[PDB]
Ligand binder design. Structure first.
Ligand SMILES: *[C@@H]1O[C@H](CO)[C@@H](O[C@@H]2O[C@H](CO)[C@@H](O)[C@H](O)[C@H]2NC(C)=O)[C@H](O)[C@H]1NC(C)=O
Lengths: 35, 49
């Protein structure tokens, strides 16, 4: 390291997985009306 | 007909308006509400058919 840095992403992987799971549950159960 | 392309929900129509260096769209959308629960069945049997 000689002056270069890396910042962490705002959204962790866990919330991304949560969003994917919510989308998948919504599309299985309610079809498309929830959109 | 493409979902969510313009306006959140089912789309009806839109209105354009000018802006100093851009455009503004007003989308008119239809949103169902007041849902009630019921019991369904896929097919009806009558006279063996
Ligand atoms: C459909 O009928 C069921 C059965 O009464 C209703 O289910 C309720 O759902 C809420 C939210 O999940 C629960 O908190 C209640 O305990 C459920 N009642 C039960 C299991 O008796 C439901 O409200 C009706 N309507 C819809 C649109 O699902």
């Amino acid at each position: 390291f000689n002056g270069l840095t890396v910042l962490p992403p705002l959204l962790t992987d866990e919330m991304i997985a949560q969003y994917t799971s919510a989308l998948l549950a919504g599309t299985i159960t309610s079809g498309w009306t929830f959109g | 007909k493409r979902v969510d392309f313009c306006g959140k929900g089912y789309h009806l129509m839109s209105f354009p308006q000018s802006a100093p260096h851009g455009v503004v769209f007003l989308h008119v959308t239809y949103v169902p509400a007041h849902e009630k629960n019921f019991t369904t069945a896929p097919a009806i049997c009558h006279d063996g058919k």
